[PDB]
Design a binder for this molecule. Structure first.
Ligand SMILES: N[C@@H](CCC(=O)O)C(=O)NS(=O)(=O)OC[C@H]1O[C@@H](n2cnc3c(=O)[nH]cnc32)[C@H](O)[C@@H]1O
Ligand SMILES: N[C@@H](CCC(=O)O)C(=O)NS(=O)(=O)OC[C@H]1O[C@@H](n2cnc3c(=O)[nH]cnc32)[C@H](O)[C@@H]1O
Lengths: 337, 335
């Protein structure tokens, strides 16, 4: 795979708004996230659509593609970070400068709707991109959870690329929709014990592919959807969906023969899942859809819309040890220097 | 293509609930639809999940597939009609009895989420199915709009298959969200003059393919999504979406090279579209996404979630005459 140079303290991070204009609509949280990273020593470059609005988005399709490309062209930038997702980053894909991305590999990071870009860039260039923090939702989060998000971000992106990396398990997590865009919290979020579950036995190792599942529907079938192959580990997460929608998306995967190929599935914790009174969780729905197909599942990985969020390279090998209840990166995912 | 026998007054219609359990949650409207069709002379057979609930759906994936299959096996049924959509009919696709459908073709009709079944059945069997009324939303509608829906349903499904069929244009329509499952009429729905527009010139003729666009995402990429081919007319409609979602779905089509293949696009009227204060309509968003590609578009065809609803065969040739502002079926679609 094509690898970006690693991050280091003091580096320059550029940020872009490929969909929702949250630098305007969540400006307090945006400023808190900016200050958070600056205090860590990072220099920030603001994408050209910062502070702009076109109703539901930051600008036209072409304006948004230009904003992103301009960060790729900047030789001082080590990391290109999404401000926030939305719905519309898939529109940009025909207009990204893939040749420039290949010539100037950088760490590209975000989540949610930005999956369309992470997956599309990988499909076109082979660059290992990252499912991880976006500036506003992730780094504008109030303590204590933001510190745990940051610890994973800095560990994954700055560590020496020698030997496997085994993920830590956050002690507590939350998905509450409070404390969004004001100076002070209303009240502390509920902190849940980590209820991640490992369904299966033994160890499965394979290339991880995926992201936000609902977002993948916007690139599915196209040259921008990475081909899923025998032995891959599928990583999928969704946010604020009804159980009805979750069944639909799992059945989409089934119809596409994905469950005939993959050797394991990672479900990210689902933010504020709506079970419609059934008390069912997503894993139970997946089990029905699987129709007897035995695939081991890591249910509740902390790489999703819940807080805190771990950073995950996409398109490299992971090993899930179902017996020891852990998950590791086993393939180099950044340049050694 | 594989063609079903035409409908006749007095035939038996069977109904099924492949997703939302609205025979329970919209029972008043359900009864209105049943009574409406019975008064027209039809006999109705209730699918086995009628009156059942499993929270957000009518039953398990397998039981829903069985409900549908049992209607296919019933020799008395000439039309299989959806009760209502939802989100989940794509789940049934591995379990439908496609061989039985081929062996005794019937009229299969519905819309919205049921697109997954209409499209999947066509992909597997070549059967010409119908984007059209579902029992509860369509035939449980109060007069006067229900009468216009019915007029199209009966015309399309009973007419002799000789010469082209040119659609009538409903004079007025509505998408107002009132008088759903209430027993009394607060008042008639607000009625709007028909604002359908023909963007283009000349005449375009090609096989129509599509349905509810959001629903197509649940079958996309699979063997159940019919291949879109050079010359097709793409028919798409959506309901109650944000402009953000509409842009995403149009861009999905673009990324899939759909706009390099199609000869025209039909946009169904979009029920209660949310433009996020932009004042933009779906056609304007499509125009941006097309990035200069000159595809003629019929914007606002009355085959969608708005009332009244026309009945449209899928998988046969239509001719859109942009100069004369009309649309016709030009290929035989019933036996
Ligand atoms: N959720 C996907 C869209 C795709 C999908 O959901 O299927 C997305 O792109 N989200 S996003 O724009 O990046 O938002 C990221 C996070 O930001 C959170 N968020 C956004 N606005 C608000 C808010 O007003 N209050 C609380 N939380 C908010 C939201 O709960 C989500 O977890
Ligand atoms: N909307 C698609 C799903 C595809 C999608 O929208 O992404 C669908 O399957 N719809 S449906 O379950 O068949 O609903 C059909 C119609 O039923 C109407 N409806 C349902 N419940 C209500 C209600 O409570 N009030 C008013 N109208 C309602 C609504 O206007 C919609 O047009």
């Amino acid at each position: 795979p094509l690898l970006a140079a690693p991050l280091a303290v003091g580096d320059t991070i550029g940020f872009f708004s490929s969909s929702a204009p949250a630098t305007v609509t969540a400006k307090n949280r945006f400023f808190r996230g900016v200050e958070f990273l600056q205090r860590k020593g990072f220099k920030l470059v603001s994408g050209k659509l910062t502070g702009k609005t076109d109703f539901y988005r930051s600008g036209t399709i072409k304006e948004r593609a230009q904003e992103f490309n301009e960060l790729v062209y900047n030789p001082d930038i080590t990391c290109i970070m999404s401000t926030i997702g939305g719905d519309n980053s898939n529109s940009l894909l025909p207009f990204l400068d893939y040749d420039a991305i290949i010539a100037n590999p950088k760490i590209i990071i975000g989540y949610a709707d930005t999956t369309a870009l992470l997956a599309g860039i990988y499909a076109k260039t082979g660059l290992i991109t990252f499912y991880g923090p976006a500036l506003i939702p992730s780094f504008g989060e109030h303590p204590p959870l933001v510190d745990i998000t940051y610890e994973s971000f800095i560990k994954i992106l700055t560590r020496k690329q020698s030997g496997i990396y085994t993920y830590t398990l956050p002690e507590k997590w939350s998905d509450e929709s409070i404390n969004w865009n004001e100076n002070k919290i209303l009240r502390p979020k509920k902190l849940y014990k980590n209820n991640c579950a490992f369904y299966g036995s033994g160890k499965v190792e394979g290339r991880v592919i995926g992201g936000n599942l609902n977002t993948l529907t916007g690139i599915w079938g196209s040259e921008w959807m990475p081909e899923i192959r025998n032995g891959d580990i599928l990583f999928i997460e969704d946010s604020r969906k009804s159980i009805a929608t979750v069944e639909r998306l799992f059945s989409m995967l089934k119809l596409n023969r994905v469950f005939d190929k993959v050797s394991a599935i990672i479900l990210g914790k689902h933010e504020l899942f709506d079970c419609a009174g059934s008390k069912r969780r997503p894993y139970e729905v997946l089990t029905e859809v699987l129709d007897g197909k035995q695939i081991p599942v890591l249910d509740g990985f902390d790489c999703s819309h819940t807080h805190p969020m771990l950073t995950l390279p996409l398109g490299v090998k992971l090993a899930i040890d179902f017996d020891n209840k852990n998950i590791s990166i086993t393939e180099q995912y950044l340049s050694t220097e």
